[PDB]
Amino acid sequence: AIVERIVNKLNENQKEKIGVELPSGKRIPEFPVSHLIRFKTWKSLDYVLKDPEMGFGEGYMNGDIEVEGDLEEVIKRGMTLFHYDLGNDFYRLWLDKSMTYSCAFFEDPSMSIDEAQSLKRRMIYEKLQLKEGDTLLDIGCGWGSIILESAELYNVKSVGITLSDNQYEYVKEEIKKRGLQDKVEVYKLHYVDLPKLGRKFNKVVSVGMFEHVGKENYETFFNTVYRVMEEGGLFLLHTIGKLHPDTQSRWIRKYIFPGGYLPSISEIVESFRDMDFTLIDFDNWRMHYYWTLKKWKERFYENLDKIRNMFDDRFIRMWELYLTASAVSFLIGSNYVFQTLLSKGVKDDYPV
Numbered sequence: 001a002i003v004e005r006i007v008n009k010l011n012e013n014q015k016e017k018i019g020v021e022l023p024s025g026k027r028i029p030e031f032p033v034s035h036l037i038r039f040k041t042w043k044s045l046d047y048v049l050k051d052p053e054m055g056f057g058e059g060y061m062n063g064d065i066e067v068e069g070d071l072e073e074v075i076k077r078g079m080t081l082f083h084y085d086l087g088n089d090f091y092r093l094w095l096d097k098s099m100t101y102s103c104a105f106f107e108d109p110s111m112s113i114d115e116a117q118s119l120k121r122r123m124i125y126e127k128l129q130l131k132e133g134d135t136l137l138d139i140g141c142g143w144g145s146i147i148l149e150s151a152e153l154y155n156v157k158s159v160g161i162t163l164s165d166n167q168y169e170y171v172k173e174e175i176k177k178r179g180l181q182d183k184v185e186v187y188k189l190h191y192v193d194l195p196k197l198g199r200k201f202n203k204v205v206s207v208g209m210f211e212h213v214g215k216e217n218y219e220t221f222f223n224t225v226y227r228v229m230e231e232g233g234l235f236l237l238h239t240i241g242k243l244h245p246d247t248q249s250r251w252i253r254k255y256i257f258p259g260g261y262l263p264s265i266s267e268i269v270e271s272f273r274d275m276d277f278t279l280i281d282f283d284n285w286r287m288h289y290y291w292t293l294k295k296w297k298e299r300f301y302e303n304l305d306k307i308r309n310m311f312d313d314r315f316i317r318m319w320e321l322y323l324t325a326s327a328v329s330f331l332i333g334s335n336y337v338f339q340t341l342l343s344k345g346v347k348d349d350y351p352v
């Protein structure tokens, strides 16, 4: 009844029809469809009707909702209309070789994730005008690809901070393996404690970390960055964001990223309203994250047998929904990726 209206809305002007199978086994529509959503319990259907995001996410995770066909198409049409220990050995199965956990840059969708992450890093180095003698700080350095490669390519002295023990030990070992002990440092450190390093930097980068800061902490974040920068330095901030302030994902917060906040352009910029930062450039990479998440999901499926041997079926459904729904959010224009290049003080000689 209400179910038939929703199915009708989902199929308006669509070649590939979506259908629903009720717990009784009854189909709506009672004709062949391209994508079938099966509800095993009336409770799971009730949940979706009342709360599509949490109802579908938890119902899919728990196995009450099955999808025959293309999960991305189903998630796209629906979103348009409407504890596990994760070790380095899990991430290595679907991130690229450099273990970069952030948006890549694709000259073309056929580009490999490794090439696209290497290009993304090169574009960041170029934006920062990196040169020998610079001091580079990476706030939220993950598995270290930027602090390691910048030192090897440009002979900068680089420092990364991360909150993850697993990342810290991995980067420590990479520094040793590559003989970079005199050029690269890494610390397990919250950004608020950056002044304790007792150092300033003329180049600062932060990629995929700002989403975890929380809106109530933005002024503290930009004040901290300002205070550890040399006058005339450059700060490249790369974050997922929104075009306008909007609702945050309860499902992502519950299962993937507690305490995350995706800010709008206005929320980012007004965070540093009382500070001597000048805007150099603002870059939008939205569709590149769609392609990044598509490549991650492809590699995830390539290694699905091992991942299942490491985690249960509920985890796999959770992770595949995370990668799929996240990709869709960029595809349909709900989320963006923004790169903001700021100077400390008014810089008038940035190249054209």
Ligand SMILES: CCCCCCCCCCCCCCCC(=O)OC[C@@H](COP(=O)(O)CCN)OC(=O)CCCCCCCCCCCCCCC
Binding pocket: 003, 006, 007, 020, 037, 048, 052, 053, 054, 056, 057, 074, 075, 077, 078, 079, 101, 102, 208, 211, 212, 240, 247, 248, 249, 251, 252, 253, 257, 260, 261, 262, 321, 325, 326, 329, 334, 335
């Ligand atoms: C009869 C009826 C039948 C019809 C059924 C059809 C119904 C079909 C509905 C199914 C949707 C359930 C999935 C709901 C999940 C979800 O919603 O998709 C996650 C997106 C979109 O959510 P939105 O609401 O658009 C933005 C506000 N956060 O959100 C993100 O965060 C994207 C993460 C980005 C990647 C992260 C990588 C690297 C990490 C770096 C930092 C990330 C920080 C993220 C913190 C939040």
Ligand SMILES: Nc1ncnc2c1ncn2[C@@H]1O[C@H](CSCC[C@H](N)C(=O)O)[C@@H](O)[C@H]1O
Binding pocket: 099, 100, 101, 102, 139, 140, 141, 142, 143, 161, 162, 163, 164, 167, 189, 190, 191, 192, 206, 207, 208, 209, 212, 213
């Ligand atoms: N409050 C905080 N202080 C310092 N680092 C933080 C932080 N909150 C999150 N992070 C770090 O930010 C990183 C997010 S994952 C992004 C990693 C890396 N920049 C890349 O692009 O691949 C992780 O290193 C995480 O530990």
